[PDB]
Design a protein around this ligand. Structure first.
Ligand SMILES: Nc1nc2c(ncn2[C@@H]2O[C@H](COP(=O)(O)OP(=O)(O)O)[C@@H](O)[C@H]2O)c(=O)[nH]1
Ligand SMILES: [Ca+2]
Ligand SMILES: [Mg+2]
Lengths: 76, 167
């Protein structure tokens, strides 16, 4: 029950998900240690069927719904 | 500018993440959040020169074990970290040294042995000279005792690996 997240400046992390956490909850420590404010960033799921097209997500999305998804965080 | 792929290795809880985050971000991580995968990047002035550092901060898990030679094959420089307050984490490193030399087909691999948590002198259970002995044994390997909390020797770990790479 993890999610891999690609990040700005060619960085990446994998986070553990406990049922009930939002996406922002599962990522907040990894974003803080890299000075990334989610209010200055968009987060996307990568659509592997659609040649990797990025679909933008709400920071409050249920993280359990995203287990196994690979996400990308970009600056606005 | 030159890029430097560095890899931070060692057992759980020794300060691999705290050292890496102190270095790149200048903050100390107080609580223990076991790492699954994390990479960081930093551009640094070494001696007097531009260096892009990518640092891979590793987990102590079966999965890392199953990927480790891949991290070693790709990494150019290795920090092997133990904690002066935890004996088993020092005994765990020998294996890691021999594997790096196995994977890189040489004994001249940029490496540094790092005894971390040197601010916890009252809790020390591995000697300074005891770590210097292990490094000596590893073909006069670079050796530092560090503290992510007190910022002792943090930058020096990564700068010594970049200087090693350059030679
Ligand atoms: N006192 C002190 N605590 C440290 C130091 N480095 C890490 N720690 C603490 O040790 C625990 C494990 O650190 P962490 O970086 O997660 O370990 P990792 O599993 O090797 O990545 C954390 O609570 C850190 O706060 C240090 O140099 N001094
Ligand atoms: Ca997937
Ligand atoms: Mg860690």
């Amino acid at each position: 029950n993890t999610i891999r997240v690609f990040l700005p400046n060619k960085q990446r992390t994998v986070v553990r998900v406990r049922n009930g956490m939002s996406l922002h909850d599962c990522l907040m420590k990894k974003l803080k240690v890299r000075g990334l404010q989610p209010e200055c960033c968009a987060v996307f799921r990568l659509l592997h069927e659609h040649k990797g097209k990025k679909a933008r997500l709400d920071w409050n999305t249920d993280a359990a719904s995203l287990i196994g998804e690979e996400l990308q965080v970009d600056f606005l | 500018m030159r890029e430097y792929k560095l890899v931070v290795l060692g057992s759980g809880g020794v300060g691999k993440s705290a050292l890496t985050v102190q270095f790149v971000q200048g903050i100390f991580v107080d609580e223990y959040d076991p790492t699954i995968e994390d990479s960081y990047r930093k551009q640094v002035e070494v001696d007097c020169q531009q260096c892009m550092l990518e640092i891979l901060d590793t987990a102590g898990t079966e999965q890392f074990t199953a990927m480790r030679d891949l991290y070693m094959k790709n990494g150019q420089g290795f920090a092997l970290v133990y904690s002066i307050t935890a004996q088993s984490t020092f005994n765990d490193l020998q294996d890691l040294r021999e594997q790096i030399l196995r994977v890189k087909d040489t004994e001249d691999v940029p490496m540094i042995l790092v005894g971390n948590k040197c601010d916890l002198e009252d809790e020390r259970v591995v000697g300074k000279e005891q770590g210097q002995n292990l490094a000596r044994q590893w073909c006069n390997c670079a050796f530092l005792e560090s503290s992510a909390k007190s910022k002792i020797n943090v930058n020096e770990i990564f700068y010594d690996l970049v200087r090693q790479i350059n030679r």
